[PDB]
Paper text:
To investigate the functional role of the human NLRP14 PYD, we set out to crystallize the wild-type protein. The asymmetric unit is built up as a tetrameric arrangement resulting from a dimerization of dimers. Each of the four crystallographically independent NLRP14 PYD monomer structures adopts a canonical pyrin-domain fold with its N-terminal helices α1–α5. By contrast, the typical C-terminal α6 helix is not present as a separate secondary-structure element. Instead, the two C-terminal helices α5 and α6 combine to form an extended stem-helix, which we refer to as stem-helix α5/6. The dimer encompasses an extensive interface area of 890 Å2. We concluded from these experiments that wild-type NLRP14 PYD predominantly exists as a monomer in solution, with a monomer:dimer ratio of approximately 83:17% as judged from chromatogram peak areas. Nonetheless, the dimer constitutes only a minor fraction as shown by gel-filtration chromatography. Together with the thermal stability experiments, we conclude that the wild-type NLRP14 PYD will be mostly monomeric, with its C-terminal α6 helix contributing to the hydrophobic core only transiently.
Author numbering:
A (entry chain A): 6 to 96
B (entry chain B): 7 to 100
Amino acid sequence: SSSFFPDFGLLLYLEELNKEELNTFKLFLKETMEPEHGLTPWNEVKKARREDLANLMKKYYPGEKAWSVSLKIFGKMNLKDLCERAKEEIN
Amino acid sequence: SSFFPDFGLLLYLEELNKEELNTFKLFLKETMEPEHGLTPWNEVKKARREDLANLMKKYYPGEKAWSVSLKIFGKMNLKDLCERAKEEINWSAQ
C-alpha cells in the first residue's frame, strides 16, 4: 500500500499554512463533510489544532481518501487565492 | 449549462501568469499520462489559454474537467508550499 499522507505529509503542509489559511482549510473541509457527516463533526474541526486536524482527516477519510480530499481543498484554496488576486487586479 | 467548463476553466486559466500556466500544463501532462500517454503533450505544451481550455473539455467533458482542474490547482498549491518548507527546513537549497 501507499500514500501515507495524513501521517507524514499533511501535518507539514498544515504547519506551512498561516492562521487565516488554516481556517480556510477547515472551512472547505466543512463543505465536503457536511453533506455526508452534517455539522456534527464540525465543532471538532474548527477548534482542532493542526495535529488534531490531521488525526480527524485520518479518521473520517481513511486510505487515499485523505489525500484526494486534501488535494481538492488545496485546489479550491488556490482558486480562492486566484479569485482574490484577480479581484485585486480589477481594482 | 455547465459554468465551469465554458467560462470557469477559461477565466482562472486566464488569471494564471506565464510561469503558473506552464506548471499547470506540466501537472496536466502528469494527469493525462495514464490514459493518453505523451501523445497530446506536444499540443498542450504550446497551446494558448483558449486552446488549452478547449483541449480539456475534449478529454474531460462534463464534471470530468472540474475534478481534473481542481486536483491540478491543488498540486500547484502544494508545490508552492513544498518549495517554501524546503527552504525553511534547509537554508542552503534553492
